[PDB]
């Protein structure tokens, strides 16, 4: 709902005479860019009722559980799903169950079925003859999507995670002798994305787009994609998500006008340099 699945255990786990029960939140994902949010009541948030609650993994959502043999074992979510977005904060609080909630946004493309788990377990809290419930989240991600319209600035000079970086975007750009600037061509309804270089220093994509018509007029006032294309969405626009130097964009179906835009990227260079180099990135929308 609203591209967000919520598992809210706030009112699911309190001790009752018939507890413990198992409260299972089943999240099934088969479409792009879904945000998953999990709320787990904190010990002490109500006087007695969560006194022995525990959440697993402690480092959720960075670390998740998967089922191996018959056991739940900890794995890094970013290794399970390339391009997944974990932001450091949720409403300006650490993205960690010690603040009561975690969130992450799944990417435009998932190649293989992936199933992982979180636990929010109040079944060891007792009060008189009551016991709390055991909360479990099962996230089942089905394969979905196809390559992302956009560009992957790849770390090698020429042509297990390196394989994903090379199959995820429609245009690959290698470090050495690049003769093809990134050109992301989108139409109404499309998802786009750029994996920015590992040694990126800064970029004006996509907060400072410059419109142009055939020839570049360097003086033209810049504007964000969100302000140029009403109801567009940019993901990880802060580029503060862990692991992946990526941004995604979505162009709404409502948007049927044509734009030609550019932004640019600066790399980390030897401090010996007097002159810095900005490399242009081209974005077109509904190019006729
Ligand atoms: C920018 O878009 C908003 C919201 O867009 C609407 O919802 C989308 C899902 C899509 O279906 C669009 O066709 C819609 O316009 C516009 O604001 C709204 O205007 C509509 C009139 O059609 C009205 O019914 C809504 O209640 C309004 N909602 C809000 C939050 O204002 C807004 O006018 C657009 N801005 C420009 C400059 O075009």
Residue numbers in the entry: 587 to 745, 759 to 887
Article excerpt on this structure:
Pfs230 is one of the leading transmission-blocking malaria vaccine candidates in development. The 6-cys domain is a β-sandwich fold formed by two β-sheets of mixed parallel and antiparallel β-strands, with typically six disulfide-bonded cysteines that are positionally conserved.
We determined the crystal structure of Pfs230 D1D2 by single isomorphous replacement with anomalous scattering and used it to solve the phase problem of Pfs230 Pro-D1D2 by molecular replacement. For Pfs230 D1D2 one molecule is present in the asymmetric unit with all residues defined except for 13 residues of a loop within the D2 domain and two residues at the C-terminus. The D1 domain of Pfs230 D1D2 folds into a three-on-four β-sandwich and as typical for A-type 6-cys domains, the first two β-strands are pinned together by a disulfide bond between C593 and C611. A second disulfide bond is formed by C626 and C706. A short linker region connects the Pfs230 D1 domain with the D2 domain, which folds into a B-type 6-cys domain with disulfide bonds at C736–C781 and C804–C862. The orientation of the two domains towards each other is similar to tandem pairs of other 6-cys proteins such as Pf12, Pf41 and Pf12p, and is stabilized by several inter-domain contacts. In contrast, LMIV230-01 did not form a complex with Pfs230 D1D2 showing that its extensive interactions with prodomain residues are critical for its binding to Pfs230.
